[PDB]
């Protein structure tokens, strides 16, 4: 008859919530990250169909926390602009977006003060009949970004700790929700750029097959629709001004950087080819129509909200600014290049954190950024018109949706190497997932050997991960030891197989079924078997002592 046999290193897994670590004086690519692995091993799991859900992927929330945590830490040692909150006597420089302001500054010696001046943008100034104050003075103290930092969105690779694995959905037309017949396993993600933006997603990944439109629920007009493009659209933005910096000493080793202007003033703007955009829009509308088969499609401007939403926000590698994209989110489009006007802020409120504020220093000389539009965020108007037309608008604001637009292909699971199966005996990477239980047993070492040390503000995470990996490893080894199966990969025991545990044919089990399928059926009695196995060894130990005593 059949007996219990223990297998260690079987290719099965379950959804898990763990912590991933960062693989590369940048603001994001900090010194605490590890070197990347230049050769990812995309092992194809043929005959394995995993189900993904980008809308419940904890990786996104983890990413969000990571980005913020780093940001805050990076600006920790930077100058706090406390003494800046003084009476501002301002005049003019009709592009009157810049005001020349004078104020009283406290010198190195507390007993002494003097006059000083700086150029500020109207957007950063609040009327207090020509006296003003800095906008932040009634909310919090803005921290001046350290003069020697880099805000370039250097791509970050996420890697799993030993015992865990990252699955990829390689189905180029996957909607981000459902089965992925085309699935592979990797140790790390690719390099994803921490691009902070709204409306139009820049410098992201392009679709590999076609334009894909995905959402949590198209029937829910309170949710955002994410569209990923296959063909990129070039957009170039520039700030054609002599923003000469000035160094103002505001304390004992604390320098404030003020803006100055040498020449004249021209508004910043973006340049996007009309013909290009038009084509992209037409293509997107077509795909939308497929979901909304008997209606017209119209693109309009933002319904309203904070500047950060109504306009296109992005970091041009320098000073942050916002552009008016009403010329793009439209139905009437010209072939000629479209110029979009923009405005610049010195005082920036990151994300949606109240009380958080940073001040950006001026960059001497002009700036020009060449970037690609890779996708965008749209929302649909509620209700329905007799005109049988649906209206879509730009939106965003929650950076999690930006991250979600890149990490949607990844899923994190934990490997459960210990399995039990019925056999006819009595005692005395992960590619095998697609193989049958029998054949899969020939790769137990290949898998098991990589479940311990595969790894060889981020510091604490790496340390925690290391400990966890050890705990799990030892736990399993302890069990194998107790059951008298130490050092074995396939261990036949002295416990008989139950009839209530399975009614499957032995041949089907080993020749047809895979370990994943088996687990889902036999797991019902996991603890039951373990208990019996422990009792068996106890019996054996006393029997050995009995014999030894002779």
């Amino acid at each position, epitope marked *: 008859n059949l007996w219990v046999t223990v297998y260690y290193g079987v290719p099965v897994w379950k959804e898990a919530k763990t912590t991933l670590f960062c693989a590369s004086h940048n603001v994001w690519a900090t010194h605490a990250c590890v070197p990347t692995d230049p050769n990812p091993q995309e092992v194809v799991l043929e005959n394995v169909t995993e189900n993904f859900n980008m809308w419940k992927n904890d990786m996104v929330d983890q990413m969000q926390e990571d980005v913020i945590s780093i940001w805050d830490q990076s600006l920790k040692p930077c100058v706090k602009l406390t003494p800046l909150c003084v009476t501002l006597n301002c005049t003019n420089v009709t592009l009157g977006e810049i005001k020349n302001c004078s104020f009283d500054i406290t010198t190195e010696i507390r007993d002494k003060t003097r006059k000083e001046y700086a150029l500020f943008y109207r957007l950063d100034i609040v009327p207090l009949s020509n006296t003003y104050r800095l906008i932040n003075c009634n909310t919090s103290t803005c921290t001046q970004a350290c003069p020697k930092v880099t805000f370039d969105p250097i791509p970050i690779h996420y890697c799993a700790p030993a015992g865990y694995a990252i699955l990829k959905c390689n189905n180029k037309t996957f909607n981000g929700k459902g089965p992925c017949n085309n699935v592979s396993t990797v140790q790390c993600t690719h390099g994803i750029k921490p691009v902070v933006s709204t409306q139009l997603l820049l410098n992201g990944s392009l679709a590999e097959e076609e334009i894909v439109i995905r959402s949590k629920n198209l*029937a*829910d*007009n*309170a949710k955002i629709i994410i569209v990923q493009l296959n063909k990129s659209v070039e957009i170039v933005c520039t700030r054609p001004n002599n923003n000469t910096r000035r160094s103002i000493r505001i304390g004992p080793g604390q320098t404030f950087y003020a803006t100055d202007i040498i020449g004249d003033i021209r508004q910043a703007y973006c340049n996007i080819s009309g013909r290009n955009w038009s084509e992209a829009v037409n293509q997107v509308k077509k795909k939308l129509k497929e979901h909304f088969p008997h209606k017209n499609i119209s693109f309009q401007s933002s*319904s*309203g*909200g*904070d500047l*950060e*939403i109504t306009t296109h926000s992005f970091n041009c590698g320098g000073e942050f600014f916002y552009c008016n994209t009403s010329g793009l989110f439209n139905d009437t489009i010209s072939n000629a290049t479209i110029m979009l006007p923009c405005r610049i802020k010195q005082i920036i409120n990151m994300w*949606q954190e*109240v009380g958080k504020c940073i001040y950006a220093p001026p960059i001497k000389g002009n700036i020009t950024c060449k970037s690609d539009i890779t996708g965008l965020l749209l*929302l649909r*108007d*509620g*209700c*329905n*018109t007799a005109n049988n037309a649906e*209206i879509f608008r730009p*939106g965003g*604001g*929650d950076m999690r949706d930006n991250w979600r637009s890149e990490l949607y292909k990844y899923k994190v699971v934990k490997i459960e190497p210990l399995g039990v199966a019925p056999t006819r005996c009595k005692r005395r990477f992960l590619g095998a997932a697609g193989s049958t239980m029998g054949a899969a047993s020939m790769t137990l070492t290949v898998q098991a050997r990589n479940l311990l040390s595969g790894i060889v503000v981020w510091g604490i995470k790496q340390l925690q991960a290391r400990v966890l990996a050890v705990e799990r490893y030892l736990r399993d080894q302890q069990l194998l030891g107790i059951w008298g199966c130490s050092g074995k990969l396939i261990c036949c025991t002295n416990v008989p197989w139950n009839s209530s545990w399975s009614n499957r044919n032995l041949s089907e089990i080993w020749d047809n079924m895979t370990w994943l399928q088996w687990d889902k059926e036999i797991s019902n009695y996991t603890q039951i078997i373990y208990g019996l196995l422990e009792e068996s060894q106890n019996q054996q130990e006393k029997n050995e002592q009995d014999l030894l005593a002779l």
Partner: antibody
Amino acid sequence: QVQLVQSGAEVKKPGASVKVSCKASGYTFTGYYMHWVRQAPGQGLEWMGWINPNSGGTNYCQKFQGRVTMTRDTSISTAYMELSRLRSDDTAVYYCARGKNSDYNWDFQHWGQGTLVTV
Amino acid sequence: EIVLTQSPATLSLSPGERATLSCRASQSVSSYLAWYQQKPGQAPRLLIYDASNRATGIPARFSGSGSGTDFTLTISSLEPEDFAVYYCQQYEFFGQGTKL
């Protein structure tokens, strides 16, 4: 507990505009979307739109586009709605409402007293 | 779009009895439904959500079920206090409701 407190009833002349406030308490103001819906005087309810206090983002019912606008002030946990070009058919009780869960926010578990506006 | 229809428009019922209220839609919405109680001069109150779950403070005798495009609210042990208007809701779409 939580509650929504709306302004009192108001009477305007046709063509004019009305402003209706709604103060929230008992929870994080920016935790959930605020919805506006009006109850017609002897008929079913008609959804107006909603606002997201985190960014002031809005979504208006198509039929009122260009007539209604919404905003907010987080410092006083108060939402605001305004309707211009008022008509006689706009007479209704405008309710301030909040959903139960941040995930499915259409479950309007929490309601204000409603504000009656006429011409 | 989604158009919700309920019936019977009105129901003259007595205490202790049982009755149900239908709700239909032209499109499948799985189970994302809600039912609201409406009394004269009062604010709307959530009764049932997900077409299965009772709202806070709602007695067990209030239930309902449905799927896809055909849903129904069920109320047992009817009371005089139930003589109100009940609405069927899906997303921003409100039905006409019925009166007991």
